[PDB]
Ligand binder design. Structure first.
Ligand code: 60X
Length: 385
């Protein structure tokens, strides 16, 4: 329904991540925590680091419990010490839970200078928790210990322009609704895709279009080796072969302007005179997802206002191409999530999408969530082995 206490509780941006305020320990220690649907550990800075202005001080918490076990995570990388403590979300459900916490003591290229977050809240399933699936993730603890419904929803709000150091701290970056769906955060209908398996938030893509033109690849290629929804990734990441076909089609649709190789590789910015970004030359991208009804799919459509990420250069409007290659499957990252209100319905093993009330668009085109479409043999789109 309406969850006013949680609306507008996020800050950040697609390139540095979106974070929520949390408290750990007794008395409570306030920390900003990155919302990550791509991992399943709650891990916080617990020792001085040049990029941290605060960290979890276990010796100052009367409710700290030492699990006497280390955790080593090479992905960047971080190392820590496992323990439990009382955790709350001030702009969240009015509950306090006893949760696992990985106290980060050593790290390399993990913390981002100026991101304003000091830890990560892994919201995915126990299967991918470190060191193993016996370390209960935060959300599992929250549901087990309280009457909070087994569901959360995310509205990540891209500003559509660069935010400087002060503006990003003062700006609302979106909402994380814990235990519900807030109807003010979306327009139109919510469409649901099944969660294929509970590890990452794995989904099945059944068709891809660029300006309505079918990419026409065997649908197994779109999900090779998996397709996931990940708020902790900036870009829309596509499998190598899919990325090559998609970039060729996006280049062909936008061919009235020639961009350098570095732009298409997501490395180099492109700039236009203030207000003149030629949105209309870039195509919309539609991803069709498996529906909840047999032989039915629906589509989510994004604009270049989602896949062109605003960056500072001057008075020019500058962007980086936020679609990149992957060797680990499709990743529907923040730049795709910015177009939609996304419902992680764990209780019903499904993910919902609706057009976000905060998506960036122009007067001629909008993001969309539409259906149904008749789609056959959708289970064949899923990859095995
Ligand atoms: C919290 O614990 C664990 N965390 C991770 N992560 C893997 C990282 C990554 O590559 N992506 C795409 C991701 N989505 N998240 C991460 C992440 C996100 C934003 C960021 F600025 C830094 C990050 F490191 C964090 N992986 C395991 C197994 C963890 F146990």
């Amino acid at each position: 329904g309406s969850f006013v206490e949680m609306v507008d509780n996020l800050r950040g941006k697609s390139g540095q991540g979106y974070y929520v305020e949390m408290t750990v320990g007794s008395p409570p220690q306030t920390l900003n925590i990155l919302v990550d649907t791509g991992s399943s550990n709650f891990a916080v800075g617990a020792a001085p680091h040049p990029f941290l202005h605060r960290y979890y001080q276990r010796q100052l918490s009367s409710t700290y419990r030492d699990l006497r076990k280390g955790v080593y995570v090479p992905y960047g990388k971080w190392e820590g010490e496992l323990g439990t403590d009382l955790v709350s979300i001030p702009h969240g459900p009015n509950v306090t839970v006893r949760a696992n916490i990985a106290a980060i003591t050593e790290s390399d290229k993990f913390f981002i200078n100026g991101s304003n977050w000091e830890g990560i809240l892994g919201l995915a399933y126990a299967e991918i928790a470190r060191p193993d699936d016996s370390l209960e993730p935060f959300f599992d603890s929250l549901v087990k210990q309280t009457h909070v419904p087994n569901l959360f929803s995310l509205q990540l709000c891209g500003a559509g322009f660069p935010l400087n150091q002060s503006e990003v701290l003062a700006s609302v970056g979106g909402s994380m609704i814990i235990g519900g769906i807030d109807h003010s955060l979306y327009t139109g209908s919510l469409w649901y895709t099944p969660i294929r398996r509970e590890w990452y938030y794995e989904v099945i893509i059944v068709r891809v279009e660029i300006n309505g033109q079918d990419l026409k690849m065997d649908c197994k290629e779109y999900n090779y080796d998996k397709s996931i929804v990940d708020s902790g990734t900036t870009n829309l990441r596509l499998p190598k072969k899919v990325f090559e076909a998609a970039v060729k089609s996006i280049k062909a649709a936008s061919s009235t302007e020639k961009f350098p190789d570095g732009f298409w590789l997501g490395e180099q910015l492109v700039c236009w005179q203030a207000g003149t970004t030629p949105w209309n030359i870039f195509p919309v991208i539609s991803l069709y997802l498996m529906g909840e009804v047999t032989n039915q799919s629906f589509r989510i459509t994004i604009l270049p206002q989602q896949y062109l990420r605003p960056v500072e250069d001057s008075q020019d409007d500058c962007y980086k191409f936020a679609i990149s290659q992957s060797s680990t499957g499709t990743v529907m990252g923040a730049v795709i999530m910015e177009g939609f209100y996304v419902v992680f319905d764990r209780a019903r093993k499904r993910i919902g999408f609706a057009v976000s009330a905060c998506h960036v668009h122009d007067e001629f085109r909008t993001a969309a969530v539409e259906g149904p479409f008749v789609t056959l043999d959708m289970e064949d789109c899923g990859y095995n082995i």
